[PDB]
Write an enzyme that holds these catalytic residues in place. Structure first.
Site, PDB file in Angstrom:
ATOM      1  N   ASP B  22      12.010   9.035 -28.718  1.00  0.00           N
ATOM      2  CA  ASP B  22      10.647   9.183 -28.296  1.00  0.00           C
ATOM      3  C   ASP B  22      10.427  10.044 -27.071  1.00  0.00           C
ATOM      4  OD1 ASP B  22       9.865   7.042 -30.169  1.00  0.00           O
ATOM      5  OD2 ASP B  22       8.519   6.237 -28.545  1.00  0.00           O
ATOM      6  N   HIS B  39       9.541  18.986 -30.978  1.00  0.00           N
ATOM      7  CA  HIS B  39      10.480  18.436 -32.102  1.00  0.00           C
ATOM      8  C   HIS B  39      11.579  19.339 -32.129  1.00  0.00           C
ATOM      9  CE1 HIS B  39       8.248  14.779 -33.085  1.00  0.00           C
ATOM     10  NE2 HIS B  39       7.228  15.472 -32.855  1.00  0.00           N
ATOM     11  N   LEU B 133      32.888  11.310 -35.134  1.00  0.00           N
ATOM     12  CA  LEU B 133      31.624  10.503 -35.048  1.00  0.00           C
ATOM     13  C   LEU B 133      30.684  10.626 -36.350  1.00  0.00           C
ATOM     14  CD1 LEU B 133      29.337  10.076 -31.986  1.00  0.00           C
ATOM     15  CD2 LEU B 133      28.156  10.945 -33.956  1.00  0.00           C
TER      16      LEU B 133
END
Ligand code: 2ZW
Ligand code: 2ZW
Lengths: 229, 240
Positions: B22, B39, B133
């Site tokens: 957020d 973004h 990962l």
């Protein structure tokens, strides 16, 4: 100007007892006093529902003497709290796999339900022998049986249907989901409490131990909640 | 009166971290820029966090990249967001692959625009053998919708006599969730991070995150870096 449904994880009973050189069990008795204060005050404030995490499925792993003491609290201290909540127009209900509770415990909770069933004020909803994933599992199991029994088709499977099969189905439709979830004793986590119903809830964390959570503390939680919007 | 000395302290790194990214729009509007600029900046932050978390020993990062409610945003904003992995593929994916990071996605990803889905599939196929990962994108994702589809699939398997209703357990449900392709001991986040100061659940991994530690910061996602991730890991260590 108040959240209609508040979920509460009443942590810190044992920690409170410890800070006071008392056996851990005394803290749970003190927790009943805090719930009495919060329930009465929230009812006056206009809160429609309080769902409390009274006993989780993981709480059975605690020492036998502690589980027995906890289970005996609504049995022995029924007269100390229930007539007063009933006089306050509070409706008592419970959610969870409540059939697995000791006979006397279940009887004490059922007696309190039957007494307050016509009450129009705040609903005090006890989550007893409750686990969120187990609640979803039993709902998903029942929907599957109903599908197999042709009572519903697989096209009927929706989020709305699932909500009708959760333990919270008996709460009025618009009140099933908590608007606010309070957690005391400083732990920042959910512990499998209302995962589906609480998916959009506002969360409030306090370092205050549950037996010390009073009207002023509830008013802070409500004040913070209203500030989120 | 003090002296700067380094101390060897044993710290537990959470195996799976969930992130609600957020504050992209808030970051851009603060910089007098359109929300969309934020973004693009969020991609930079994720690149930093993904590379640093991989070095730290984090096994999984599940990011809340696009929710079902995000489709309600203005068309031009949704189109821009959907185009980010299409246009900026070369800017991030080869570097993540060189870093031994595995890219995966969860959600109703068939509803994504053809080009978006193609860009994510290309990134999955490139990194599928990577042993580091796992960067897991939750795209067109909603927690309740995920649980719902798992039941829709379970009831159909009961109906087709593939399983009986007595087979319906928490373990079975986990195998039908979107997270089923993550190794079994890594499906659930140990820590859930949320940036931009919102202290709320947003339908992100309700089943899998039922026992997770929660970490909230006022830091906007594009400003979330290695130091910020290290603070979140630090906070996780000081928990029960
Ligand atoms: C406060 C409060 O106000 N009313 C009750 C109550 C509710 C039902 C029956 C008896 C009582 Cl004392 C009550 C209370 O704390 N009940 C309670 C206390 C302990 C338990 C255990 C079984 C987890 C369950 C319910
Ligand atoms: C950081 C980062 O590192 N690699 C990617 C990536 C992952 C898959 C495909 C292409 C890219 Cl650029 C990536 C990233 O931010 N991807 C991304 C960005 C935006 C979206 C939208 C559709 C919500 C989806 C994925």
């Amino acid at each position: 100007q108040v959240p209609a449904h508040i979920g509460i994880i009443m942590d810190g009973n044992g920690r409170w007892a410890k800070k006071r050189m008392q056996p851990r069990v005394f803290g749970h008795k003190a927790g009943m006093e805090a719930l009495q204060t919060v329930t009465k005050a929230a009812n006056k404030l206009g809160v429609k529902v309080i769902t409390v995490y009274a006993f989780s499925t993981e709480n059975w792993t605690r020492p036998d003497q502690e589980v027995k003491f906890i289970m005996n609290l609504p049995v022995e201290f029924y007269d100390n709290y229930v007539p007063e909540l009933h006089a306050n127009n509070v409706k008592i209900q419970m959610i969870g796999e409540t059939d697995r509770l000791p006979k006397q415990t279940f009887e004490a909770l059922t007696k309190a339900e039957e007494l307050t069933k016509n009450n129009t004020g705040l609903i005090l909803n006890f989550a007893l022998n409750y686990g969120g994933r187990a609640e979803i599992t039993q709902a998903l199991k029942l929907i599957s049986q109903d599908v197999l029994d042709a009572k519903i088709n697989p096209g009927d499977i929706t989020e709305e249907l699932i909500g009708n099969y959760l333990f919270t189905q008996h709460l009025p439709k618009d009140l099933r989901d908590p608007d606010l979830i309070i957690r005391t004793s400083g732990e920042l986590r959910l512990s499998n409490f209302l995962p589906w119903q609480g998916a959009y809830s506002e969360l409030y964390f306090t370092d205050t131990l549950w037996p010390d959570f009073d009207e002023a503390a509830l008013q802070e939680a409500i004040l913070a909640y209203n500030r989120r919007h």
